[PDB]
Structure 1
Amino acid sequence: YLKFEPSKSFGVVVSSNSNLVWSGQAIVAANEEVLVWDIKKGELLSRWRDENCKFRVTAIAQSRTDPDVFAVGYEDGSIRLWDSKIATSVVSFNGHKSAITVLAFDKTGVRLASGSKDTDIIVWDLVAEVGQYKLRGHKDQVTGLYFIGFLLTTGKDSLIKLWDLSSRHCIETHVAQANGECWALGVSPDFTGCITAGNDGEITVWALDALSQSVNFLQNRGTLHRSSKERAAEVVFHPLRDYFAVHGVEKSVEIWRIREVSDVFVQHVIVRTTGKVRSVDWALNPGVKDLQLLVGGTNNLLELYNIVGKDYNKALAVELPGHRTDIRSVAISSDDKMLASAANGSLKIWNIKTQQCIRTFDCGYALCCAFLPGDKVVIVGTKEGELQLYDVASASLLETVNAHDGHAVWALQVHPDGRSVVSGGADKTAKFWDFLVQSRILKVSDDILSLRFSPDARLLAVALLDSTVKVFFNDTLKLYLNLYGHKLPVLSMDISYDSKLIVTSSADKNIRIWGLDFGDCHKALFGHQDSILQVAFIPHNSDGNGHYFFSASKDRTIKYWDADKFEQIQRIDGHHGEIWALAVSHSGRFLVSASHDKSIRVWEMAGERIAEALELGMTDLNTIREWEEARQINPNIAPPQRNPIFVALGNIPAETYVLNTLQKIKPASLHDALLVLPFSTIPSLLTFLNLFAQRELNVPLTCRILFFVLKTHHKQIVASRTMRATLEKVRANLRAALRRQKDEMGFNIAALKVVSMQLRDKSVREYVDETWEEKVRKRAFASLS
């Protein structure tokens, strides 16, 4: 039951997320890991590969004033601070919910902003390693972040937002686009201006200055428009000269210069790139008078252009350590030391121990690929119905035949003896080519999807568009038998080395285990959330495991199964774009995995409560009056040093505290807790009520609890003495407060009587006639009895 482990992972340069970085080194993001290459020589300097986290990362940031320490923001919402001196995440922050979108570093690098798709923005002390706080604006997700302290940010609702840092809330807002969406944010590093790129290609330009009155810092000094009316992706300034670059995801970037606003800024150049650029990045090099623009193109490429200052030239490039459009097929060698790699547009073969590409060919499309025994030569069936033949040694194309007209040849199977190949197309014919020439063709009902030989070259089986399978004899092409039951067309097949079993994978999210003697389905099995792409046995039962097999499925999953017990023995995660192809070692020692991830991987008490609150408020009043005596003696610095719980509650006054913590409880319980209070607690409560009346609030409550205290202890109060002055205070305060209230509302009802009668007099009658009977509320009052 040897479980398998990802041993290698490669074939790739920058994924389709943003945030390229330059240092003469290029810092790009793989799927999970973050790797650095040299641009002069295409050798990667290193990788930053975290064994703990498997989420993709999409946010990459360099600390200003300190390189070699770098922040990354993942798909889950985590933050990792690494070094380049040593490939170690020094810290991780897990504060958001999903997909850290924008990062930000301090001018001094002690502070870090994290903006996410989950729309909340969390700042981070970088020496206390704490979520400092959490600015909450932004009805939808952030599309930009910058530090000034102060913060400027833009969110996808086309909303630009200026927060303070010391006083945690925003002070300025504007909209970029009334109906559109601000997508990108560009800041003058000298804090003079800001530009907002919105989805029409509209670049609104803004001037910036560096509270009871009208604060105004930003001004829309105008708007501009680029040529591309696409969603602009990113706008990057020159750190030194007066230039910047606008782009969306396109094969073009518009570099404009700095000298009305359209006069201020004109397009310097527009660089056409070979591919849709994902992310742009700046580079300046020591000793050049040029501009090193480092673009990372969505089709898995790196490009370096030189811009002259007072035309572009494709100066440097990185394409060879990975394919470019989408990997489709794989054929690992019989000695299992190299492998052919078949992508749309390209074919690259690679040595596995170097995990490094050795040869490269251009195709148009690559449906399927397979070397020929001896591994001298390789074969690709391609979308146009056609068939192309290359060799690995001279690195050339040998032959090419039109297998089908334009009927994409879906399946390719070398003969087990290795003197013929068979080819199955988007036509109704499966052809047979002995090497070559065409030995024999096969006419069927529908278009063939997949097929395979028998390891003992004795049978074959085909898997058709009709959700079915036709097992035929190898020698003569007679119907052995047929398979059904799959509701959707069977996508792949695989049979046992002893030709005793078949797994059949279809797009109906399940596989079938067939017994190959009369073809009884030994077990139908739903085991994948999506369309299972491919299935593969191990050839060798020399380990004693030959009826174990593997399933690659559209939910980014590989699953390891045993047919004999019909059980899941392992589950294989690790890719994040949908897997397309995979292959097993001839010895079965490992396996390679090709995905739309564009990677290949190799796998080996109540009153008591108010009593204490009263006590706390007494202490509060004591330190407050003492602080008053201090500040009255001298206006020197004097902190009141209230309780941590008061300052945790936001410096609220003690009276507010006690009234709130009393008003929380229900009335009956109030009656009883007020009852249960003891007499030492009484006069402090009296002083609180005195404060309440003097700063009157919830006056019926105050009177009520007052009278309760007095009646339940009417004797002990007239026993004591120190009550007397306090009771006089509460008498004066309460009597004046009640008088104030009553007099005001009595004024109110008086004036209301006046205006009501006057209104009636306005609304008496106008005409005078014989019918005076035109001269009243009513209510319903259902009663059941």
Structure 2
Amino acid sequence: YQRFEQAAAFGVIASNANCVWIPAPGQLITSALEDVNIWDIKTGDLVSKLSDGLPPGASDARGAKPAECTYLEAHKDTDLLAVGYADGVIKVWDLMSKTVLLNFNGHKAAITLLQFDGTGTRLISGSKDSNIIVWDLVGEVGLYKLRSHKDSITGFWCQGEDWLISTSKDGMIKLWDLKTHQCIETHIAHTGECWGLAVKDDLLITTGTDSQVKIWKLDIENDKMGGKLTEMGIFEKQSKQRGLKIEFITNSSDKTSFFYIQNADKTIETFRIRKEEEIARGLKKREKRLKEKGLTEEEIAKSIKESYSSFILHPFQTIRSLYKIKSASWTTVSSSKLELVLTTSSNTIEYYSIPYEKRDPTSPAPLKTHTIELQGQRTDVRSIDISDDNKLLATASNGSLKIWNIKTHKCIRTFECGYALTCKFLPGGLLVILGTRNGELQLFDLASSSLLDTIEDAHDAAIWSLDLTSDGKRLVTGSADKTVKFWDFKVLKLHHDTTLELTDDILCVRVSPDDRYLAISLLDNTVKVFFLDSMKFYLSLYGHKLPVLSIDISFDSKMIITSSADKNIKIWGLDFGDCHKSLFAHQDSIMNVKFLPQSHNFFSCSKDAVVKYWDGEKFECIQKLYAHQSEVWALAVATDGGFVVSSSHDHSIRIWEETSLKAGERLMEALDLGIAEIEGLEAYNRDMKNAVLIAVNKTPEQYIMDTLLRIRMSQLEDALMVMPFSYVLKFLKFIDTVMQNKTLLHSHLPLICKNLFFIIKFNHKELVSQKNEELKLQINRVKTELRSALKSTEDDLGFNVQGLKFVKQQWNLRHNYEFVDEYDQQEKESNSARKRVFGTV
């Protein structure tokens, strides 16, 4: 067999990520699923496309869907692009070389935000896994991880090396110390999620789920244990939806600051920060107005605090777009006008310019200057077809039809239509026919670039399926109105010929290549076969659990394939209607299946975003094609069979072309290292009058003590016996050193006692024989302080037991009834006394 590889991918302008603007209106950088697109706003043409490599379908290609780009961030000064992907991978891209420089893998989920530091040598990454990791570009390593948040990092602010502020979907705002790697402050930003965060000087603004927007003053150097972040006031934005992004831009000439609040709906709301003089002027005026109203000074002060937000912010203008907005970014700031660029969810780029003068803008609505719309379709493609020459590809989507040159990948013509469902080329490659959901039939000519004829009442309901005979003179249309209508082409217009009325809704109609069989799927899970010439019923294929969605007949009109919503592909013999095999092909509904021409091999696409290659004779899966991110709605095969074109819910059209130490032994090592250090420091101290320990960051006494703790008690007594006597003197010097450090002595006093006494007992005979005077002093010192530590613990135990006994006794006198008769007392004490139950043999 031969391998299919992704020859090209086009039709995507803006995927689910942010947009990065780069000055030359300048160019724009935007994500296209796994690839990144650089657009020239003025011309609207693609400047370049960033592809890592490893085309889908290759043997070396991975067996999972590619990770889509989630966040884009570029450092303008250094011309480096950092790209975050849905799988938690950061790739640093050289813009000039259009190649990957670095590859960071530290996150387990999609990356939500990337931000270069001011110097461009360190990158801060926040991801849906709730972690913020600071990376070192020159070092190619992750410096440290910030792990306080309990949900996706929505936004974070770090302009200074020393502090960082982070916001997360759990509704918390946290102040971080980059030099300590800890959270210093924690406050609840909003009642639920917190999504926006923008900081200008001390001013800090955050957005929650509702229209409430909070203002905080950022007193970094307060250092009170608190108050670095304090709530100033709350202002309500007009849009009731959540606010996604907030960004500041400052006019250098006038020092004016503006910021927007990108909502989840089709609205961007811009705000202006009032200058201090404007605030003082306004504060005095409102005081005059409110004093004129007769309110008290205390009420005036409280009202001023209640109306605090109004003084600083001024609603400037609202940008309304036809489609939902995905991301936005400031482009240019000037006294004359203010400009913004945004990306929608419907795969288009919009450039908005706002001319303004002083407080308010000049025009009621923003001026839409530039749009990039030609090279993409707003709605998902529902059907595709390829011209007989295999040069022109027709793609029908809701509201528009676009036609592409397979070689140049560029749209040639665009036609406005209804909710298109099916599209096929007529013979000659000069005409296109459509079946809209409104029952209309539309025919288009490419040369005229205009619609010739519309049959408004072609069907009473949606025209789900449409097929042509090999001769091309007849058309077969199936619709939800439970009828099949035959149409003829007479010089060009369509005349209805015959109606075939069925019992249930029609989902697919297929005409055999030889025009002898007409296979039709029904909503009752049955596929009927008819004889085209006579319209005589032939067969009723049965056995699909859910309605059949696609049908395709082999080139020899012998074998017919049915793919249903029950995830099964069933292969039948047209001679007798016998089912050769049923394949559990995909994990979701299978939308289309097509035969490879002059062969029985067929392709299949499903809602699981997988296109699979099958063998029509051996009934095995040949190749799995993982390139699409979402449902694959349509599929088309070239007449020559050279390539296959697939369109998915991600607005992408893809063309597939055919190409050890034991206890005791460890302790002896610990004694050698530690006591060499203790002896060295002592000898150094006497005169004046290692790598392992510094790496572990522990003192010599602690290092030996820890090694003692790791030894299991069942092994400890056997471990101590193995030591030679020379190490016992070393051990006795270690314990002497511990005695000075009173914190260690009481921390592990029972352990120290058990080991010491066992050592003395085991080799008592050799110890007493030695005549070392220094040894005699050590044991004396070890003895005295060992006793005091033991006595200190003992006195506390003795004091408390006598005290607690007294506490028990006094309560008895006050709240314990007493019988003078002994026998009555005994009966009570038996009942009051605690009882326990035991199994007995």
Cα distance in 2 for residues equivalent to 1:770 and 1:619: 72
Q: Percent identity?
A: 47
1:457 aligns with 2:509: no
Cα distance in 2 for residues equivalent to 1:782 and 1:591: 79
The Cα of 1:769 is off from its aligned counterpart by 14
Match of 1:554 in 2: 607
The Cα of 1:647 is off from its aligned counterpart by 4.5
1:58 aligns with 2:70: yes
Report the AA paired with residue 34 of structure 1. Answer: V
SS in 1 for 2:761: helix
Cα distance in 2 for residues equivalent to 1:375 and 1:624: 93
Match of 2:347 in 1: 300
Cα distance in 1 for residues equivalent to 2:686 and 2:382: 82
Unaligned runs of 5+ in 1: 634-641
Cα distance in 1 for residues equivalent to 2:833 and 2:52: 76
Cα distance in 1 for residues equivalent to 2:315 and 2:671: 70
Cα distance in 1 for residues equivalent to 2:208 and 2:819: 66
SS in 1 for 2:435: strand
The Cα of 1:763 is off from its aligned counterpart by 2.8
Q: Tell me the alpha carbon deviations over residues 42-68 of structure 1, each in whole angstroms, 9 at most, x when there is no partner.
A: 1111111112482111011122642x2
Cα distance in 1 for residues equivalent to 2:819 and 2:766: 73
Match of 2:768 in 1: 718
Contact 1:28 1:34 in 2 (8 A): yes
Q: Map 1:616-655 to 2 at 5 A.
A: 616-622=673-679, 642-643=690-691, 645-649=692-696, 651-655=697-701
Q: Tell me the alpha carbon deviations over residues 614-655 of structure 1, each in whole angstroms, 9 at most, x when there is no partner.
A: 22222443566689899x99xxxxxxxx53x44454x23333
Cα distance in 2 for residues equivalent to 1:258 and 1:575: 44
Q: Map 1:389-408 to 2 at 5 A.
A: 389-408=443-462
Match of 1:672 in 2: 718
Compared CA separation, residues 625 and 386, structure 1 to 2 (3 A): farther
Q: Map 1:604-623 to 2 at 5 A.
A: 604=657, 605-622=662-679
Contact 2:189 2:206 in 1 (8 A): yes
SS in 2 for 1:367: strand
SS in 1 for 2:4: coil
Contact 1:365 1:383 in 2 (8 A): yes
Match of 1:639 in 2: none
Contact 2:485 2:499 in 1 (8 A): yes
SS in 2 for 1:364: strand
Q: Tell me the alpha carbon deviations over residues 484-534 of structure 1, each in whole angstroms, 9 at most, x when there is no partner.
A: 100000110101111111111001101011111112111111121111110
Compared CA separation, residues 288 and 366, structure 1 to 2 (3 A): farther
Match of 2:124 in 1: 113
Cα distance in 2 for residues equivalent to 1:516 and 1:672: 84
Q: Which residue of 312, 317, 323 corresponds with 1:275?
A: 323
Moved more, 227-236 or 567-576: 227-236
Contact 2:568 2:583 in 1 (8 A): yes
Contact 1:454 1:495 in 2 (8 A): yes
Report the AA paired with residue 672 of structure 2. Answer: E
Match of 1:35 in 2: 37
Match of 1:387 in 2: 441
The Cα of 1:288 is off from its aligned counterpart by 7.7
Report the AA paired with residue 282 of structure 1. Answer: W
1:132 aligns with 2:150: no
Match of 2:754 in 1: 704
Q: Tell me the alpha carbon deviations over residues 134-157 of structure 1, each in whole angstroms, 9 at most, x when there is no partner.
A: 111111121112213221111100
Contact 1:329 1:341 in 2 (8 A): yes
The Cα of 1:230 is off from its aligned counterpart by 1.2
Contact 1:502 1:513 in 2 (8 A): yes
- Bigger RCO of structures 1 and 2 (CA < 8 A, at least 6 apart): 2
SS in 2 for 1:5: strand
Match of 1:2 in 2: 2
Report the AA paired with residue 733 of structure 1. Answer: E
1:657 aligns with 2:707: no
Moved more, 313-322 or 234-243: 234-243
SS in 2 for 1:736: helix
Compared CA separation, residues 627 and 670, structure 1 to 2 (3 A): same
Compared CA separation, residues 620 and 103, structure 1 to 2 (3 A): farther
1:504 aligns with 2:566: no
Match of 1:374 in 2: 428
Compared CA separation, residues 668 and 772, structure 1 to 2 (3 A): closer
CA RMSD of aligned residues (A): 2.3
Compared CA separation, residues 300 and 244, structure 1 to 2 (3 A): same
1:744 aligns with 2:744: no
Contact 2:19 2:343 in 1 (8 A): no
Contact 1:65 1:108 in 2 (8 A): no
Match of 2:196 in 1: 184
Structure with bigger helix share is: 2
Q: Tell me the alpha carbon deviations over residues 548-604 of structure 1, each in whole angstroms, 9 at most, x when there is no partner.
A: 110011110111111111121111110011111111111111111100011000111
Match of 2:310 in 1: 262
Cα distance in 2 for residues equivalent to 1:409 and 1:629: 101
Compared CA separation, residues 622 and 419, structure 1 to 2 (3 A): farther
Moved more, 212-221 or 54-63: 212-221
1:156 aligns with 2:169: yes
Cα distance in 1 for residues equivalent to 2:148 and 2:518: 64
Q: Which residue of 672, 679, 688 corresponds with 2:734?
A: 688
Match of 1:246 in 2: 261
SS in 2 for 1:737: helix
Q: Which residue of 758, 775, 778 corresponds with 2:834?
A: 778
Q: Tell me the alpha carbon deviations over residues 647-678 of structure 1, each in whole angstroms, 9 at most, x when there is no partner.
A: 454x2333333223212232221111011112
Match of 1:636 in 2: none
The Cα of 1:709 is off from its aligned counterpart by 0.7
Contact 2:19 2:28 in 1 (8 A): no
Contact 1:257 1:268 in 2 (8 A): yes
Unaligned runs of 5+ in 2: 55-61, 275-307, 358-362
Q: Tell me the alpha carbon deviations over residues 205-242 of structure 1, each in whole angstroms, 9 at most, x when there is no partner.
A: 11112399624311111222211111222112225441
Compared CA separation, residues 628 and 166, structure 1 to 2 (3 A): farther
Report the AA paired with residue 681 of structure 1. Answer: Y
Cα distance in 2 for residues equivalent to 1:291 and 1:242: 11
Cα distance in 2 for residues equivalent to 1:551 and 1:270: 47
Q: Which residue of 215, 227, 245 corresponds with 2:238?
A: 227
SS in 2 for 1:661: helix
The Cα of 1:365 is off from its aligned counterpart by 1.0
